[PDB]
Design a protein around this ligand. Structure first.
Ligand SMILES: *[C@@H]1O[C@H](CO)[C@@H](O)[C@H](O)[C@H]1NC(C)=O
Ligand SMILES: *[C@@H]1O[C@H](CO)[C@@H](O)[C@H](O)[C@H]1NC(C)=O
Ligand SMILES: *[C@@H]1O[C@H](CO)[C@@H](O)[C@H](O)[C@H]1NC(C)=O
Lengths: 25, 88, 48
């Protein structure tokens, strides 16, 4: 999780939350 | 000037609609607009008294109607997505 | 068993550094995340 990593939300591109939280995964 | 409340703003000919807040980002003196990776306006400087104001879109998010089958109930629970519960 | 134990454990250890010391192992993931954020940038820049 260290290696991998409203800007687009300003227009309309809304990043929906993945159903399963990482803690569940 | 008003803060933390969605307004439709014009600053020295720059127009935009957002939530103007206080902000800690520090301009260079000659500068005018802060910006972001998208080139979209991000931070501004209040001309009449120099201060660094953020911006922010209104809210948006999609409405979502959570329902049991209309065969069970006619009751629904509305989910406003990706918002804070005030503007409702 | 005892031998296989050590070979296992010492193998697990190097998995840390294999990840710890090189950032390109995760490229597959990293490529997915980038390409998504990529097209979004492109999609945004099309507004201008
Ligand atoms: C605006 O007016 C106030 C006092 O009326 C003054 O202190 C401030 O410097 C003025 N702003 C500019 C940009 O001149
Ligand atoms: C669905 O509603 C119909 C009436 O419109 C009813 O006859 C049926 O039993 C219902 N089925 C379920 C699974 O609720
Ligand atoms: C909602 O606003 C309150 C204060 O107005 C703040 O404490 C909270 O963190 C906010 N939550 C979100 C998700 O913006």
């Amino acid at each position: 999780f260290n290696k991998v990593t409203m800007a687009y939300r300003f227009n309309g591109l809304t990043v929906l939350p993945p159903l399963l939280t990482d803690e569940m995964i | 000037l008003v803060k933390n409340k969605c307004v439709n703003f014009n600053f020295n000919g720059l127009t935009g609609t957002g939530v103007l807040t206080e902000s800690n980002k520090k301009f260079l003196p000659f500068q005018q607009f802060g910006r972001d990776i998208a080139d979209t306006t991000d931070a501004v400087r209040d001309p009449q008294t120099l201060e660094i104001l953020d911006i922010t879109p209104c809210s948006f998010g999609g409405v979502s109607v959570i329902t049991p089958g209309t065969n069970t109930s006619n009751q629904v629970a509305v989910l406003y997505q990706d918002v804070n519960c005030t503007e409702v | 068993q005892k031998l296989i134990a050590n070979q296992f454990n010492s193998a697990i250890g190097k998995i840390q550094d294999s990840l710890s010391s090189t950032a390109s192992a995760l490229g597959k993931l990293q490529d997915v995340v980038n390409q998504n954020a990529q097209a979004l940038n492109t999609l945004v820049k099309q507004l201008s």
